[PDB]
């Protein structure tokens, strides 16, 4: 749900962030195709969407349960249908970016794999790092497993 004036952030599994004002997009009818809003590359899919609100809340994840917390304000904003910057290091211990959430402290998150294995932990043990950093161990993923879900649990 989007109010009259806010911001839209798009994310990709290859570490792409695109921020632009929602004013540049006009309302349309029901059975309308739409328009392109991000200069998407090749071999990538938009796997997450966040509407920023408040401040000081950002989290990511990978196929092996590696993520980090970064400041919201350090993400550059350009016009729509434009290339973004690298959000997190791909490396080889992480895999592919699955989803992103806007969670501050005093909250908890849940991660579920393709074969169940539900888990619930807090965000106190994850610190604030720079954007160009690799992930750290969050959940001990098992063999033949990849993280599929990521949800935020409030206080």
């Amino acid at each position: 749900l989007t109010s009259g004036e806010d911001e839209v952030m798009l994310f990709s599994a290859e570490g792409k962030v695109v921020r632009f004002k929602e004013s540049s997009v006009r309302a349309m009818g029901c059975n309308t195709t739409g328009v392109r809003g991000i200069r998407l590359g090749e071999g990538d899919k938009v796997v997450s969407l966040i509407v920023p609100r408040g401040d000081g809340a950002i989290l990511t994840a990978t196929q092996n349960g590696y993520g980090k917390r970064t400041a919201v304000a350090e993400y550059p904003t350009k016009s729509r249908a434009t290339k973004g910057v690298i959000s997190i290091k791909v490396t080889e211990r992480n895999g592919l970016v699955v989803g992103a959430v806007q969670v501050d402290d005093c909250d908890q998150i849940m991660m579920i794999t393709d074969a169940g294995t539900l888990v619930r932990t807090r965000v106190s043990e994850i610190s604030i790092v720079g954007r160009n950093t690799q992930g750290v161990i969050l959940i001990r993923t098992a063999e033949d497993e990849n993280v599929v879900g990521l949800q935020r649990v409030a206080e």
Partner: protein
């Protein structure tokens, strides 16, 4: 909390059944997975929504 399968099977469970821990644990299986299926969705919401 609501879980969905690839073939499509819905269910919700009380939130109090789970407890927080330290990062790096294994974690119990939330739902008895099928022989050939996998979970592709997850959501947390109030009962009256």
């Amino acid at each position: 909390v609501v879980t969905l399968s690839h073939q499509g099977y819905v269910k919700y469970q009380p939130l109090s059944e789970y407890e927080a821990q330290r990062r790096g644990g294994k974690g119990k299986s939330a739902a008895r997975i099928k022989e050939e299926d996998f979970i592709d969705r997850l959501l947390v919401a109030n009962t009256h929504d």
